[PDB]
């Protein structure tokens, strides 16, 4: 544990609200249907995240887990429900942009669900070796996620014009750079090796989420590529 983390839950919440509020204000002049499909998907992401963050702020979706070890971890489980719904949407979004087939997006969200699910079990087990084991398999599968991202979506976008290739790189980079830190944050946070407390791990996830979501969706929506 180590409380006071709710300040990150509050600022996280409102950043989502603001990002979501902005995308609406910006998607007001929108015209082509496909562009509109992008706006629903993008605005859907911090929406869900904000509801998730609001529940955590009000203390819902918290849960204590006494480890075999003896230690007890306060674990925010709403977080993993958040990720369950939100990550297949960022994948869909970048996927649509890349012009990847639903077969390919679907295969990528298939391994995303496994990653977030096994991450959830690692967070919740009492047996501490199994925490680290399910952590290992989760990040293994995140590496295949990242591989098929750069290669399957990458190959789909190679036929596309310069600006949807440059937009897709900008988004591919964000995912690579920011999704890769999530499992290290789990590791050094209280859920893993506990180098930081609950307060600093929370801070970390909050920052990562805002750029995975508002930063990401900002770049997508604001782009000559989608009109
Ligand atoms: C495992 C994969 C399942 C697939 C479903 C994914 C969607 C479910 C989303 C969130 C699950 C909620 C976590 C439940 C743990 C809370 C009690 C934790 O209890 C603990 C306390 O010490 C009891 O007093
Ligand atoms: C703990 C803090 C974590 C924060 C993580 C860092 C946030 C920013 C992460 C990655 C930067 C994104 C790279 C943009 C690539 C654009 C070059 C290519 O784009 C395009 C060109 O026009 C190609 O001609
Ligand atoms: C907006 C939320 C996002 C982009 C969440 C991304 C989540 C991950 C990249 C999760 C990674 C994890 C592992 C690779 C295993 C260790 C535990 C997890 C769930 C943190």
The total count of strands amounts to 2
Count of discrete structural domains: 1
- Helix and strand element order: HHEEHHHHHH
Report the structural category.
mainly alpha
Gross morphology: globular
Helix content: over 70%
Q: Major sheet, described briefly?
A: 2 strands, antiparallel
Radius of gyration: 18 Å
Assign the CATH architecture: Up-down Bundle
Name every ligand kind in the structure.
[(Z)-octadec-9-enyl] (2R)-2,3-bis(oxidanyl)propanoate, retinal
CATH fold type = Rhopdopsin 7-helix transmembrane proteins
Percent of residues in β-strands: under 5%
Number of separate helices: 8
Strand order, largest beta sheet: 1-2
Under the CATH scheme, which class? Answer: Mainly Alpha
Distance between the termini: 47 Å
Transmembrane segments: 5-25, 40-60, 80-100, 105-125, 133-153, 174-194, 201-221
Function: Light-driven proton pump.
GO cellular component, one term: plasma membrane
Pfam families: Bac_rhodopsin
Overview of this structure, please?
It is classed as transport protein. The entry lists the keywords Bacteriorhodopsin, proton pump, Membrane protein, transport protein. The protein is mainly alpha-helical and 227 residues long. It has one domain (1-227): Rhopdopsin 7-helix transmembrane proteins. Helices cover 74% and strands 3% of the residues. It is built from 8 helices and 2 strands. The protein has helices spanning 6-26, 33-57, 78-98, 102-124, 128-157, 162-179, 182-188, 198-221, and strands at residues 64-66, 72-74. A two-stranded antiparallel ribbon has the order 1-2. A hairpin with a 5-residue loop joins strand 1 (64-66) and strand 2 (72-74). Helix 3 (78-98) runs antiparallel to helix 4. One [(Z)-octadec-9-enyl] (2R)-2,3-bis(oxidanyl)propanoate is lined by residues 166, 169-170, 173-174, 177-178, 181, 207, 211.
